[PDB]
Scaffold this active site. Sequence first.
Site, mmCIF file in Angstrom:
data_model
loop_
_atom_site.group_PDB
_atom_site.id
_atom_site.type_symbol
_atom_site.label_atom_id
_atom_site.label_comp_id
_atom_site.label_asym_id
_atom_site.label_seq_id
_atom_site.Cartn_x
_atom_site.Cartn_y
_atom_site.Cartn_z
ATOM 1 N N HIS A 180 0.825 -1.202 0.000
ATOM 2 C CA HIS A 180 0.000 0.000 0.000
ATOM 3 C C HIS A 180 0.862 1.256 0.000
ATOM 4 O O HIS A 180 1.994 1.239 0.477
ATOM 5 C CB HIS A 180 -0.923 0.024 1.221
ATOM 6 C CG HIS A 180 -1.996 -1.021 1.204
ATOM 7 N ND1 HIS A 180 -3.127 -0.915 0.424
ATOM 8 C CD2 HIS A 180 -2.123 -2.179 1.895
ATOM 9 C CE1 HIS A 180 -3.896 -1.970 0.621
ATOM 10 N NE2 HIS A 180 -3.310 -2.752 1.510
ATOM 11 N N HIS A 189 -8.698 5.453 10.424
ATOM 12 C CA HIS A 189 -8.296 6.468 11.384
ATOM 13 C C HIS A 189 -6.817 6.315 11.719
ATOM 14 O O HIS A 189 -6.211 5.262 11.510
ATOM 15 C CB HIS A 189 -9.092 6.367 12.688
ATOM 16 C CG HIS A 189 -10.570 6.212 12.505
ATOM 17 N ND1 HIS A 189 -11.418 7.289 12.360
ATOM 18 C CD2 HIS A 189 -11.353 5.110 12.488
ATOM 19 C CE1 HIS A 189 -12.659 6.853 12.239
ATOM 20 N NE2 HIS A 189 -12.648 5.534 12.312
ATOM 21 N N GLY A 197 -44.234 -22.081 -6.327
ATOM 22 C CA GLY A 197 -43.222 -22.539 -5.399
ATOM 23 C C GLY A 197 -43.580 -22.119 -3.991
ATOM 24 O O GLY A 197 -44.625 -21.519 -3.739
ATOM 25 N N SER A 198 -42.675 -22.446 -3.070
ATOM 26 C CA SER A 198 -42.873 -22.102 -1.668
ATOM 27 C C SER A 198 -44.241 -22.586 -1.200
ATOM 28 O O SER A 198 -44.468 -23.795 -1.089
ATOM 29 C CB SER A 198 -42.726 -20.591 -1.466
ATOM 30 O OG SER A 198 -43.002 -20.226 -0.123
ATOM 31 N N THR A 224 -48.615 -19.568 -5.660
ATOM 32 C CA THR A 224 -48.393 -19.457 -7.094
ATOM 33 C C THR A 224 -48.658 -18.021 -7.522
ATOM 34 O O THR A 224 -49.414 -17.295 -6.870
ATOM 35 C CB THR A 224 -49.294 -20.430 -7.874
ATOM 36 O OG1 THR A 224 -49.009 -21.776 -7.471
ATOM 37 C CG2 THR A 224 -49.079 -20.300 -9.375
ATOM 38 N N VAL A 225 -48.035 -17.617 -8.626
ATOM 39 C CA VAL A 225 -48.106 -16.249 -9.127
ATOM 40 C C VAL A 225 -48.904 -16.243 -10.423
ATOM 41 O O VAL A 225 -48.721 -17.117 -11.278
ATOM 42 C CB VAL A 225 -46.704 -15.656 -9.343
ATOM 43 C CG1 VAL A 225 -46.801 -14.192 -9.747
ATOM 44 C CG2 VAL A 225 -45.865 -15.815 -8.088
ATOM 45 N N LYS A 252 -50.382 -13.382 -5.854
ATOM 46 C CA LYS A 252 -49.747 -14.550 -5.253
ATOM 47 C C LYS A 252 -50.837 -15.400 -4.617
ATOM 48 O O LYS A 252 -51.373 -15.046 -3.563
ATOM 49 C CB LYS A 252 -48.703 -14.121 -4.225
ATOM 50 C CG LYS A 252 -48.299 -15.187 -3.200
ATOM 51 C CD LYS A 252 -47.250 -16.141 -3.740
ATOM 52 C CE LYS A 252 -45.849 -15.627 -3.450
ATOM 53 N NZ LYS A 252 -44.805 -16.651 -3.719
ATOM 54 N N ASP A 273 -34.439 -14.687 1.579
ATOM 55 C CA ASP A 273 -34.202 -15.414 0.334
ATOM 56 C C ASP A 273 -33.939 -14.466 -0.825
ATOM 57 O O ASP A 273 -34.476 -14.639 -1.927
ATOM 58 C CB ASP A 273 -35.387 -16.321 0.000
ATOM 59 C CG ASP A 273 -35.571 -17.431 1.014
ATOM 60 O OD1 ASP A 273 -34.581 -17.788 1.687
ATOM 61 O OD2 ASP A 273 -36.701 -17.949 1.134
HETATM 62 O O1 LIG Z 1 -43.868 -12.823 -7.764
HETATM 63 C C1 LIG Z 1 -44.497 -11.820 -7.438
HETATM 64 C C2 LIG Z 1 -45.107 -11.736 -6.064
HETATM 65 C C3 LIG Z 1 -46.458 -11.477 -5.884
HETATM 66 F F1 LIG Z 1 -47.233 -11.350 -6.982
HETATM 67 C C4 LIG Z 1 -47.045 -11.354 -4.649
HETATM 68 C C5 LIG Z 1 -46.263 -11.508 -3.517
HETATM 69 C C6 LIG Z 1 -44.898 -11.772 -3.630
HETATM 70 N N1 LIG Z 1 -44.076 -11.893 -2.473
HETATM 71 S S1 LIG Z 1 -44.355 -11.115 -1.059
HETATM 72 O O2 LIG Z 1 -45.672 -11.453 -0.624
HETATM 73 O O3 LIG Z 1 -43.242 -11.365 -0.201
HETATM 74 N N2 LIG Z 1 -44.330 -9.563 -1.519
HETATM 75 C C7 LIG Z 1 -43.235 -8.657 -1.115
HETATM 76 C C8 LIG Z 1 -43.619 -7.287 -1.665
HETATM 77 C C9 LIG Z 1 -45.071 -7.427 -2.065
HETATM 78 F F2 LIG Z 1 -45.799 -6.358 -1.501
HETATM 79 C C10 LIG Z 1 -45.531 -8.708 -1.425
HETATM 80 C C11 LIG Z 1 -44.360 -11.888 -4.904
HETATM 81 F F3 LIG Z 1 -43.047 -12.170 -4.993
HETATM 82 C C12 LIG Z 1 -44.655 -10.683 -8.356
HETATM 83 C C13 LIG Z 1 -45.270 -9.479 -8.108
HETATM 84 N N3 LIG Z 1 -45.209 -8.680 -9.213
HETATM 85 C C14 LIG Z 1 -44.549 -9.353 -10.204
HETATM 86 N N4 LIG Z 1 -44.313 -8.881 -11.433
HETATM 87 C C15 LIG Z 1 -43.661 -9.730 -12.243
HETATM 88 C C16 LIG Z 1 -43.237 -11.016 -11.883
HETATM 89 C C17 LIG Z 1 -42.525 -11.896 -12.843
HETATM 90 C C18 LIG Z 1 -41.981 -11.427 -14.033
HETATM 91 N N5 LIG Z 1 -41.319 -12.198 -14.902
HETATM 92 C C19 LIG Z 1 -41.200 -13.490 -14.563
HETATM 93 C C20 LIG Z 1 -40.448 -14.370 -15.502
HETATM 94 C C21 LIG Z 1 -40.770 -15.832 -15.538
HETATM 95 C C22 LIG Z 1 -41.167 -14.952 -16.680
HETATM 96 N N6 LIG Z 1 -41.679 -14.063 -13.449
HETATM 97 C C23 LIG Z 1 -42.333 -13.252 -12.614
HETATM 98 C C24 LIG Z 1 -43.505 -11.463 -10.588
HETATM 99 C C25 LIG Z 1 -44.179 -10.617 -9.718
#
Ligand SMILES: O=C(c1c(F)ccc(NS(=O)(=O)N2CC[C@H](F)C2)c1F)c1c[nH]c2ncc(-c3cnc(C4CC4)nc3)cc12
Lengths: 227, 228, 311
Positions: free
Chosen positions: C1, C35, C77-78, C81-82, C94, C187
């Site tokens: 250094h 410092h 998952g978890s 579903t989305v 979700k 996560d």
């Molecule tokens: O996944 C979620 C989601 C949700 F809908 C509800 C709850 C939670 N989690 S939570 O409850 O912790 N959450 C924390 C803050 C919130 F207030 C609540 C989520 F993670 C998304 C929300 N909007 C999005 N827009 C786009 C995409 C998307 C886009 N492209 C792809 C590629 C594969 C093509 N896949 C996915 C995903 C989401």
Amino acid sequence: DKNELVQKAKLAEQAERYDDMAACMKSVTEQGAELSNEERNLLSVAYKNVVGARRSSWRVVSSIEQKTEEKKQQMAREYREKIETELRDICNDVLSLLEKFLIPNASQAESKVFYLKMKGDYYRYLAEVAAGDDKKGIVDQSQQAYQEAFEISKKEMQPTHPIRLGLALNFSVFYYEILNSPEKACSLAKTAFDEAIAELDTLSEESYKDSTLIMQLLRDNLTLWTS
Amino acid sequence: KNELVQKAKLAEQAERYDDMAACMKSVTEQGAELSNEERNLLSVAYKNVVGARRSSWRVVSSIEQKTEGAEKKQQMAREYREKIETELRDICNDVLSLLEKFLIPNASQAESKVFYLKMKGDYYRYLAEVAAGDDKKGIVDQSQQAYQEAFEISKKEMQPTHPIRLGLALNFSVFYYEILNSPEKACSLAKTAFDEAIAELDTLSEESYKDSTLIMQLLRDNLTLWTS
Amino acid sequence: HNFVRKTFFTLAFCDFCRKLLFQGFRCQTCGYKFHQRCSTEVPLMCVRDRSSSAPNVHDDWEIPDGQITVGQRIGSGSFGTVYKGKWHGDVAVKMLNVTAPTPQQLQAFKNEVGVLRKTRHVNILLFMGYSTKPQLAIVTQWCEGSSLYHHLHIIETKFEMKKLIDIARQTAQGMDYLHAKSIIHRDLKSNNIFLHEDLTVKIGDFGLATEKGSILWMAPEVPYSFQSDVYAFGIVLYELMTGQLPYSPDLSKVRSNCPKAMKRLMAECLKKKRDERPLFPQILASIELLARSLPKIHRSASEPSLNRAGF
Ligand SMILES: O=C(c1c(F)ccc(NS(=O)(=O)N2CC[C@H](F)C2)c1F)c1c[nH]c2ncc(-c3cnc(C4CC4)nc3)cc12
């Protein structure tokens, strides 16, 4: 007296305020006597930081105008000129000091390379700011000074020497950055790194950790240039 | 005038604070109340111009008081320090005259008054480090009037977690520890402000969460240091 | 250094103890800071204390059944579903697995809604409501740009270095708020990061706090603590700078034009032990130092000054 002004300049080394540091060393040089090597760095670092502040400031104001393109930019333009008109004065005072007092009384190997390399740098810093025609006149002068030091150094200095490598590092950067000759710059640095490392033991405990820093500077430049 | 405001914004990015301050001062001279954006520029401008001198002085003064006996050297350092101090004084005086001539007289809301008064209480604490003799006490007394006055308005008009109030406790508590050498009187003021913001923590807001949580770390740091 | 004296305006935090720093040294090669007190113990493998002051400053939520249109399953998952959907405009849903929860689960859901309605930071995913009547669901905003994981591996090559750093800046500026609210985002991963419009980052998957293929982003100790989130942010940096996936990760893979200040920042976050890692208030500070220095110290390296400090 000279010995007094050296202390008054190292008081601005610590606690900064480099504008005062420049004034002390500038007057020291005007006496006409040859500066000692330690006294020589103080004049180097005194100006290295005065220009370095405007260099950095000029770049930032430059990136702002390129990003806005508009009364905002019409004003931001005049402010960039304000920094430029300061860099001109700082460079001129070093060059006139180098030409009129330091260089004529050098009368020694290491001194001649130091002042000419320094003369080379402060012409380059004008190239980064000047326009086309002024850039060409400035660009040539930085090369004559760089080349002239490039001649004396290779003739007289050791295979490894901080001033020797420091001139190769700054001269190559002039090619790569000012002349846009990437291979012309690449070869110059490449040989300097090879020659120095081939005989690295010519260094000694007092400067090996000083010169070795420049070698990392050369190697990194090649790595960026090879990419 | 917005030209001055953007000029200062340009100057901050270029990092030319001596030129930034010269612009904000020209804004304050116009007799209009500063917005809470222009107002926060005047704080950054002058606290960097002064912060340079405070740093120069704190190193020169340590070069002195070292290498005892070398009179000719110690004569040179001594004369250099008092050159910095006069330059440092000229800044604080300009700030203080600026507060008392334009800003404080026209601070309408509580927020502004707790802000300008803390500045007044800060720039006297800077001079108290430089001055000596009866003038130190003449200055230190003047600092306490500003810090005390702002503290009363803060206790009444502003929420516990508001960073302005939560910083007035930080600067005022230090004034008790360093300038007045009263650790206990400093700790009590520090602990009181600290807990009141912890108790009512959820009043925290998106616009102030980072600013307020930083000061609470600084406030906690001083407490442990003093109690160390 | 090789170091020099430096006085810091704006903000900085000593790289040794990480308290607010106003007047100290720094290393010219890498930008390290410290410092004078701790200088005597700074590492050398290069690869009368005083007080500090004030620094510079710069039920109706529920949605009745049938109102929300349900589209195609985007992913699952978890414990849910989305789906994409429409409710007063575009929305995302979700769908949690349970349709008839027990009162204890429902109350847990009730508390989570109580929390999730308070958080309103820009760099987190906006909360729009919930629904219990047809099924347990939470309605959020829909971001057109897919997850950051999709922009590195499927459609890619659209990131300059400045924009590449800015994404990790907004990722920390959003996770700092999640720590200032005392929520541990367990996560974090590049698939939990989204890009709405003109690249405005949004963080998700931090919900389901009461109830609460991911191997790459799981921390080595994963087990949960504030330090664990720092490592996850470290892995996200690796994907950005390198442009690849992880697998320690090879720091050498990074681009050439990314400065060594980011090289050291990433190295700290990937530190093996929890303690040595920084915290997000500081990470967000260095990255804004690393961002102020792009339009200023972009160059081909010049000549540095000799060492002007000894310890
Ligand atoms: O996944 C979620 C989601 C949700 F809908 C509800 C709850 C939670 N989690 S939570 O409850 O912790 N959450 C924390 C803050 C919130 F207030 C609540 C989520 F993670 C998304 C929300 N909007 C999005 N827009 C786009 C995409 C998307 C886009 N492209 C792809 C590629 C594969 C093509 N896949 C996915 C995903 C989401």
